[PDB]
Amino acid sequence: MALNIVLYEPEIPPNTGNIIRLCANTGFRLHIIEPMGFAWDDKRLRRAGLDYHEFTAVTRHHDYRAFLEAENPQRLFALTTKGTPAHSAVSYQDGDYLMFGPETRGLPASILDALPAEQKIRIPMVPDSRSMNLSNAVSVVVYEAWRQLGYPGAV
Amino acid sequence: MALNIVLYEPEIPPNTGNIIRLCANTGFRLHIIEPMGFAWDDKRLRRAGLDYHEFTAVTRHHDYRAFLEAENPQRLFALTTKGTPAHSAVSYQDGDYLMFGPETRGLPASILDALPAEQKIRIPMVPDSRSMNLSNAVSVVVYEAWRQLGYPGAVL
Ligand SMILES: Nc1ncnc2c1ncn2[C@@H]1O[C@H](CSCC[C@H](N)C(=O)O)[C@@H](O)[C@H]1O
Ligand SMILES: Nc1ncnc2c1ncn2[C@@H]1O[C@H](CSCC[C@H](N)C(=O)O)[C@@H](O)[C@H]1O
């Protein structure tokens, strides 16, 4: 299937490690927009317990513009606490790209402002909550989308 | 609301830190069955970026039997790769307790064998997948259950 997770300038290695495993366990495709806050090193990756098939599937983009041009996403959603519809309120479809920001910074306003409110998605939280852990946020979105499609590829 | 997450002998501090924040963000109640693989230290907790309201809400149980006796769960589910219904296949209700195993070991067979297959839940994964990260598995279950109830307590 054709669902895509995009990490914008991820900073914390274990978050990305968790996300690689997640996408491999679900068949989602993972994209990373450079620069990252860590070395992309096959050794550290296998070191973290990741198999080759898991991390070579990942595609790395030199920057946001390069990503758009390379991927030409059919639809692009941004996950942000400043979003409107819940992640379970959108109907995901093939060719969707779901974008997440860096741990300390979040997504730059410039990228957010170019998207319709309807494509900026907020995972619900209780009032006055602090942000979710990045890999947890990705997990929640991936599994909701996958559920919507009937867990294709899971037996 | 009354939904409960239970960690059985969690080993890896950051996993638990993530789960504390998750439960606080969602209004789920967190339970931990000792012994843990780390010191329960308010200083390290606030150190990790956790607020006081987040980690004092957590209830720690000396062991599994003490947990059952203290909590008397209306229904107890175990999350295991060896489970049957998907996490999205159960209808969660108030008084549910959802139990997760430790990172290196998983839940002991003794606990699993005492549960009906119908209460052993598997989060779907592609064939020949390796286990999920613990906090990611908890997040997925928490958000599915919360979704079923209409995200009560979240203002949308
Ligand atoms: N409730 C939520 N809804 C949507 N995205 C979320 C989210 N919580 C976290 N994220 C995602 O996770 C990323 C990193 S967390 C964002 C920064 C936040 N101020 C913090 O305290 O860490 C975000 O850029 C966003 O993509
Ligand atoms: N596919 C799945 N379905 C249900 N529970 C799962 C699961 N994958 C992991 N878990 C839960 O996560 C627990 C720990 S296995 C997770 C360890 C993970 N590799 C880590 O380092 O964090 C298991 O006991 C189980 O309760």
Numbering used by the authors:
A (entry chain B): 0 to 154
B (entry chain A): 0 to 155
Please share text taken word for word from the publication where this structure appeared.
The enzyme responsible for 2′-O-methylation at the 34 nt wobble position of the isoacceptors and in E. coli was recently identified by mass spectrometry and designated TrmL. However, there is a group of minimalist SPOUT members, which contain only the catalytic SPOUT domain and lack the extension domains. Our results demontrate that the minimalist SPOUT Mtase EcTrmL functions as a homodimer by engaging residues from both subunits to bind tRNA. The overall structure of an EcTrmL monomer subunit is composed of six β-strands and six α-helices, in the order β1-α1-β2-α2-α3-β3-α4-β4-β5-α5-β6-α6.
We determined the tertiary structure of EcTrmL in the presence and absence of SAH, which is the product of methyl transfer reaction. Although both subunits have a bound SAH, the conformations of the two SAHs are strikingly different with respect to the orientation of the homocysteine groups. The adenine and ribose groups of SAH form a broad interaction network with the cofactor binding pocket formed primarily by residues from three loops (residues 78–80; 99–106; 120–124), and their conformations are exactly the same in both subunits. The SAH in subunit A is in the characteristic bent conformation already observed for SAH and SAM found in TtTrmH, HiYibk and TrmDs. Although in subunit B, the homocysteine group of SAH is located near to residues Asn14, Glu102 and 130–133. In subunit B, a HEPES molecule from the crystal growth buffer is observed on top of SAH in the potential active site and is well stabilized with high density occupancy. From the chemical structure, the HEPES molecule is similar to the ribose and the phosphate group, which suggest that HEPES may mimic the U34 or C34 of the tRNA substrate in this context. The HEPES molecule in subunit B is located in the same position as the homocysteine group of SAH in subunit A. This suggests that in subunit B, the structure is in a state in which the SAH and the tRNA substrate are both bound. Three loops (residues 78–80, 99–106 and 120–124) form the SAH binding pocket, and on tRNA substrate binding, loops comprising residues 79–81, 103–106 and 130–133 form the active site.
